[PDB]
User: Which sequence fits this backbone?
C-alpha cells in the first residue's frame, strides 16, 4: 500500500530539522521592533512565534503550505460521496506539506474510525455534568480527562529521549482526533450517553460523516449536511499560530504537557467570547435581532440594532480580526457554499446574516474603534448549522472545538520534533514602561 | 470596620487607568528588537506583556510592588497563631499595591471561609475520577468545572458593558480562591470526598489553616505545618507574567473566558514537567541520592552523585532558572524557615538538601553547560512538606496550583479593569524566516 501518515511524516522530518539548523545560524538577525503598543495591546503585530502549517496574510487571508483555500478545495481528496474537501486530508497536508492521495486518505479515515472509542470513566465523567453546564466547559474537561490515555505523559515519566518526543505526541494526536467527535456528540446528546458513547462508526466512511452519525444526522438523506460539515471542519482546522486556541495549545504544550492537556487549554481559550465562542454569540445575536425587528424589516432596523449593541458597550459578534483587514475568505467560502443552495438562501435567518454583512461594516467604521470592520468566519458558520437543524447556539463552538484540534495538534507534533523550548516571554509593569 | 478588599481596589483603579493612558500616549515608542532567536526560542527575553503585581529583579530576585520577600515577611499580617505571612495578605498586596492591616485581612479570611463550599456536581465529578488519574489533571478539571458558578460568564451571556468587566471578574476570583484549597484537598483525599467536600470551616481561621484542616492536618499539634503552608503559598503566588501558568491564565482570560476557565488553563500549564513538576522531581532525586549515599555521607559522596547525574545527560533538579542569575530569595526564605526548627534541621533528608545546595553550584559551574548554577525555590519546598508528613511528591504540584491562583487572578482583575485587548501575536514559518 501507499505510505501511511506516520511514515509520510518521517520522510519529511529530516528536511525540517536541517532548515531549523539553517534558520538557527541567523538567530542574531533582527527582523522587527518591539514598541509600547505591542506590550499593552496583547502582542498585536508582534511576529513572535513559529507555526509551520499555515501563515496568515492580512490582505490575502490564510494559506496552508502556500496553498489557498480554493487550492485546497481543488487538490485535497473528497469522500466517497459529495464534493467538499475532507478535513483529514487537510490534516495530512498540514503535517507533511504534501497533498495525500485518495487511497492514503481512505486508509487514514479507517484508522480514525477504529480509534474513536472511549474509556468508561470518560462516559461517567460526562454523565456527572449538570444539564446547565456550558457545552464548551464540558468539551474542555473531557478532552483533558483523556490524558489518562496519554502515551506521551506515560513515556515522558518513564524517561524519554528528546529526538523521539514526537512519536508519542503523534500517537496521542491521532488518538484525540479520532475520539473528539464522539466526545463532542456526547456533549450534544446528554440523555443518550450510554448509546452514543459505545455505538460503532461506519468503517467505510470519513471523519465528518462519522461525526454527523454520532450527531444523529447520518445516512444518505443527510448527505448535503455531510458536505457542509467536511467543508466547515477543513476551513476551521488551522489559522496560523497567534490565535488564542492554537497559541494556548502550544503554550501549554511547550511545558511538556501532553496533547490532551494542551488542546484542552486551547478549548478553554476557544470558549472565550472574543475567540471561538463568537460562533455561538453571532447566532444568539442574530436570533435576538430577528425577534426585535420582526419578519419584514428595513435596512435601518438592522443599523439600529447594531448601533444599539455598540452603545451598550458590547461588541458586534462575527466582525473584526486580530490580523485580517479584509473580509475573511473562510467567510466567503461558507457564503459560496450557501450560494448554490436555494433552500439555504430562502432561510430567513441566513438572509438576516447576509443583510447584516452589507450593513455592519459601515456601522463599525462609523464607530471607529476597530481596525477591521469586515466579517470573519463566525459570522456565517452558525446559521448554516441552524439551517440543517442544529438550533441551539450554546453548542456551536463545540463543532469548532472538533475542527480546531487539527492545526494545533500538527504544530505540537512539529514542536516536539524540532525540540522547540518552553514559551516564556518577558513581562513588564506600567511603571517600568514609564 | 476598615475598607474591604473590593473597596480598597476601587480607590486604586482610577490611578492605574490614568497611568495606562499616559503609557498609551507613547505607544509608538521603540523599546526593543525582535530577532530570529525570539521566534524560535519561545519568546525568551522578549518584553511583550503587561504584569503589574510583580517584577523579577534578575540579580535581587522577585519583588512584589517593589517589596522584597523579607519585606513582605515582616510587614504582611500573620494569623491568629504563628509567625509566617498570610497568603491572603499577599493577595491583598498584589491587588492593591498596599500592605493590609491585620483587621482588613481577618475580614477577608472570613469571606474566604464563607465562600469555600462547592456545588454537589463538583463532588460527583471528582468522585468519577479514576484512581490512576494524575492529580494535576484532576485539579485542572475541577477548576474548569467550577465555571458553572461564574458570575462573569453568566453576566457576559446576558449582555454586559466592557467598562463593568472587572467586578464580576473580581467576584469570580475571590470565589475561586475560596474554593481551590477544598478542591485541592479532595484531590489529595479521594476516599474522603463526602466529608472534605462539605465540612464547614472556622471563619475566624486563616486560609492556610483551613486548607491544612481539610488536609487532615488541623489543630495545635500541627501549628508548624500551618506556618510552612502559609509561607509556601505566599511565596509561590506570583512570579511575573512570563511563566507558563500565569501566561496561560492571561492568554485565555484575554479572549474573555472567565477566571475558572482561564486559571484551569494555567493549571494545565502548571501540569507540564518543565513548569510545575520540579518540586516533585527534586524530592525523588534527593531520595535516590539518599538511598545510595545513606544518612551519614561525605561531601564527595554528594559530588559523585551530582557528576553522575550530569554525565547521564540529565539536569540536577531545582537548580537554574530562565531569568534569575542568583540564588532565589524564595529558596532562602524556606531555608530560613528550617533554621528556627531543630527537628527539621535534624531530618537527614533536609540535611541532604542543605548539603546539596553547598555542593551543586560548584559542580554545575565546572560542568559548564548551565548559565544559572544556583538553587531555585523548588529545591527546598518538597523536603519541607515531606518532613511534616506529606510524603507523596506526586501531589506537590497540586499545592503549587493553590498558590499560583493568587498572582494570575490579580492580573486578570487588572486586565479587565484596564480593558486590555485579546492576546494575539503573529506567527511565521521557518521558510519565511529564511
Ligand atoms: C476579533 C477581535 C477580538 C480582534 O481584536 P483586536 O485585534 O484587539 O481588535 P482591534 O485592534 O480592532 O480593537 C480596537 C478597538 O475596537 C474594538 N472592536 C474591534 N472589533 C470589534 C467588533 N467587531 N465590534 C465592536 N468593537 C470592536 C475593540 O474592542 C477595541 O475597543 P476597546 O479598545 O474600546 O476595547 C475583535 O474584532 C472583537 O472582539 N470583535 C469580534 C468578535 C468576534 O467575532 N470574535 C471572533 C473573531 S474571529
Ligand atoms: O482562529 C480563528 O478562527 C480566528 C483567528 O485567526 C484569530 O483569533 O486571530
Ligand atoms: O532554564 C532552562 O532550562 C534553559 C536556560 O535558561 C539555561 O540554559 O540555563
Assistant:
Amino acid at each position: 500500500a501507499e505510505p501511511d501518515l506516520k511514515t509520510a511524516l518521517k520522510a519529511v522530518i529530516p528536511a525540517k530539522r536541517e532548515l531549523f539548523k539553517q534558520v538557527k545560524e541567523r538567530s542574531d538577525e533582527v527582523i522587527g521592533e518591539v514598541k509600547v503598543a505591542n506590550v499593552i495591546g496583547g502582542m498585536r503585530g508582534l511576529k513572535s512565534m513559529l507555526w509551520e502549517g499555515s501563515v496568515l496574510d492580512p490582505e490575502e487571508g490564510i494559506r496552508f503550505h502556500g496553498k489557498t483555500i480554493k487550492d485546497c478545495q481543488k487538490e485535497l481528496p473528497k469522500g466517497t460521496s459529495g464534493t467538499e474537501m475532507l478535513p483529514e486530508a487537510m490534516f495530512w497536508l498540514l503535517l507533511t506539506g504534501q497533498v495525500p492521495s485518495t487511497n492514503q486518505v481512505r486508509a487514514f479515515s479507517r484508522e480514525l474510525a477504529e480509534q474513536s472509542h472511549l474509556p468508561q470513566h470518560i462516559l461517567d465523567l460526562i454523565k456527572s455534568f449538570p444539564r446547565s453546564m456550558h457545552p464548551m466547559t464540558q468539551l474542555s474537561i473531557a478532552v483533558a480527562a483523556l490524558n489518562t490515555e496519554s502515551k506521551f505523559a506515560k513515556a515522558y515519566e518513564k524517561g524519554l529521549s528528546k529526538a523521539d518526543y514526537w512519536e508519542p505526541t503523534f500517537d496521542d494526536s491521532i488518538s484525540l482526533l479520532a475520539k473528539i467527535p464522539r466526545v463532542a456528540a456526547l456533549v450534544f446528546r446528554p440523555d443518550e450517553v450510554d448509546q452514543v458513547g459505545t455505538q460503532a462508526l461506519d468503517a467505510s466512511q470519513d471523519w465528518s460523516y462519522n461525526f454527523a452519525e454520532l450527531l444523529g444526522k447520518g445516512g444518505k438523506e443527510n448527505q448535503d449536511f455531510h458536505d457542509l460539515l467536511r467543508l466547515y471542519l477543513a476551513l476551521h482546522g488551522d489559522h496560523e499560530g497567534g490565535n488564542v486556541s492554537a497559541h494556548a495549545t502550544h503554550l501549554v504544550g511547550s511545558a511538556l504537557s501532553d496533547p490532551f492537556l494542551s488542546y484542552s487549554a486551547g478549548l478553554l481559550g476557544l470558549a472565550g467570547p472574543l475567540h471561538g465562542l463568537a460562533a455561538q454569540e453571532v447566532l444568539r445575536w442574530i436570533l435576538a435581532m430577528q425577534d426585535k425587528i420582526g419578519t419584514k424589516f428595513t435596512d435601518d432596523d438592522v443599523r439600529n440594532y447594531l448601533w444599539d449593541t455598540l452603545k451598550s458597550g458590547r461588541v458586534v459578534p462575527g466582525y473584526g480580526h486580530g490580523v485580517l483587514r479584509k473580509p475573511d475568505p473562510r467567510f466567503q467560502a461558507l457564503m459560496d457554499f450557501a450560494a448554490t443552495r436555494p433552500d439555504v438562501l430562502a432561510n430567513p435567518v441566513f438572509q438576516l446574516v447576509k443583510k447584516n454583512s452589507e450593513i455592519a461594516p459601515a456601522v463599525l467604521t462609523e464607530h471607529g474603534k476597530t481596525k477591521n470592520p469586515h466579517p470573519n468566519v463566525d459570522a456565517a458558520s452558525g446559521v448554516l448549522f441552524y439551517h440543517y437543524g442544529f438550533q441551539q447556539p450554546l453548542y456551536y463552538t463545540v463543532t469548532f472545538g472538533v475542527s480546531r484540534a487539527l492545526g494545533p495538534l500538527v504544530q505540537l507534533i512539529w514542536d516536539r520534533a524540532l525540540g522547540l523550548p518552553i514559551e516564556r516571554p518577558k513581562s513588564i509593569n506600567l511603571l517600568g514602561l514609564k
Remarks:
- Chain A touches chain B through 101 residues (CB under 8 Å).
- The longest helix of chain A spans residues 166-188.
- The domain at 278-394 of chain A is CATH 1.10.230.10 (Cytochrome p450-Terp; domain 2).
